[PDB]
Design a protein around this motif. Structure first.
Motif, PDB file in Angstrom:
ATOM      1  N   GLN A  26      10.749  30.278  46.053  1.00 40.52           N
ATOM      2  CA  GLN A  26      10.672  29.050  45.563  1.00 40.52           C
ATOM      3  C   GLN A  26      11.629  28.776  44.264  1.00 40.52           C
ATOM      4  OE1 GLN A  26       6.355  27.530  45.191  1.00 40.52           O
ATOM      5  NE2 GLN A  26       7.159  25.964  43.886  1.00 40.52           N
ATOM      6  N   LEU A  27      11.161  29.719  43.392  1.00 44.48           N
ATOM      7  CA  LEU A  27      12.058  29.609  42.009  1.00 44.48           C
ATOM      8  C   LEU A  27      13.316  29.503  42.492  1.00 44.48           C
ATOM      9  CD1 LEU A  27       9.248  30.308  40.403  1.00 44.48           C
ATOM     10  CD2 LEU A  27      10.773  30.962  38.749  1.00 44.48           C
ATOM     11  N   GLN A  29      15.104  28.208  45.071  1.00 46.95           N
ATOM     12  CA  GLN A  29      15.625  27.067  45.830  1.00 46.95           C
ATOM     13  C   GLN A  29      15.477  25.724  44.692  1.00 46.95           C
ATOM     14  OE1 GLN A  29      14.457  26.273  49.940  1.00 46.95           O
ATOM     15  NE2 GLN A  29      13.750  24.219  49.273  1.00 46.95           N
ATOM     16  N   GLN A  30      14.145  26.037  43.971  1.00 43.86           N
ATOM     17  CA  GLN A  30      13.744  25.137  43.065  1.00 43.86           C
ATOM     18  C   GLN A  30      14.478  25.146  41.635  1.00 43.86           C
ATOM     19  OE1 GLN A  30       9.644  24.556  42.541  1.00 43.86           O
ATOM     20  NE2 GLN A  30       9.827  22.426  42.299  1.00 43.86           N
ATOM     21  N   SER A  33      18.661  24.043  43.614  1.00 42.14           N
ATOM     22  CA  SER A  33      18.357  22.712  44.081  1.00 42.14           C
ATOM     23  C   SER A  33      18.300  21.868  42.922  1.00 42.14           C
ATOM     24  CB  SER A  33      17.345  22.461  45.006  1.00 42.14           C
ATOM     25  OG  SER A  33      17.495  21.259  45.478  1.00 42.14           O
ATOM     26  N   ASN A  34      17.445  22.157  41.996  1.00 42.79           N
ATOM     27  CA  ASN A  34      17.160  21.331  40.570  1.00 42.79           C
ATOM     28  C   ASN A  34      18.206  21.196  39.765  1.00 42.79           C
ATOM     29  OD1 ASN A  34      15.196  19.886  38.950  1.00 42.79           O
ATOM     30  ND2 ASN A  34      15.432  21.592  37.691  1.00 42.79           N
TER      31      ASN A  34
END
Length: 41
Positions: A26-27, A29-30, A33-34
Motif C-alpha cells: 500500500q505505501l 502503490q500510494q 502513484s501519489n
C-alpha cells in the motif's frame, strides 16, 4: 476446540506478511502513484 490460540500466535509472526507486506505494498502503490500524480501537478 478450545486449544492454545495457535493460529493467533502464528499470526503474530506472519503479521510481518499480512500487515507489514500488505502495508508496504500500500505505501508503495500510494507513494509511486501519489508521487506520479503529484509530480504532474
Amino acid at each position: 476446540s478450545e486449544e492454545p490460540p495457535i493460529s493467533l500466535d502464528l499470526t503474530x509472526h506472519l503479521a510481518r506478511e499480512v500487515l507489514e507486506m500488505a502495508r508496504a505494498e500500500q505505501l508503495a502503490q500510494q507513494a509511486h502513484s501519489n508521487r506520479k500524480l503529484m509530480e504532474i501537478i
